[PDB]
Amino acid sequence: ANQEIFDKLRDAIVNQNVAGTPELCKEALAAGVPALDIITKGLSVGMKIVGDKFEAAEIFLPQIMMSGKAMSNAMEVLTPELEKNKKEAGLAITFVAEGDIHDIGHRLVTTMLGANGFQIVDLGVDVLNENVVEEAAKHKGEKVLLVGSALMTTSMLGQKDLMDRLNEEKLRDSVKCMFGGAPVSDKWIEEIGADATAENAAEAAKVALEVM
């Protein structure tokens, strides 16, 4: 059910309706629809279409910026809804690779983690690999999970360096590492030496738990 409001949410993103997206999130929300379904069956569906349109040179950067802001505004209404049911499996240090400012997915995963029994340490975006290493050092010995984002190949490559720097500082084996984004493949995860990855907030939370 709810297909109509899903399409409206999907279209609000596709048509750069920044002001409207929030209203619809409330409309759907008030209709007893779960925040995560609003994202995965509506907003995310639209963001994907907008992604294809761009890669096909149909739309451009002015449209992508507005679709981005459209979803960020939507997240301001759903995040609090997601932080409910705060079901401490450990400490998660979240960040987006250096030179990368894409934070929608990063913010979504960080919200789920924590909502699923995790203490959060959000480093923000454009985080240097050393500041992540410095953060991991301050928490050496305890239950630590490094959650990293990167939506650009150029920034995703730096994840290798990160893993390499964690070893040079013999800090690795004491922490679990999960990278994500999209340019991140199940191949690249082992090429460097990570412990996992997810494709969405939902799975991210599950994998985070399983990886103990």
Ligand SMILES: [Mg+2]
């Ligand atoms: Mg810089």
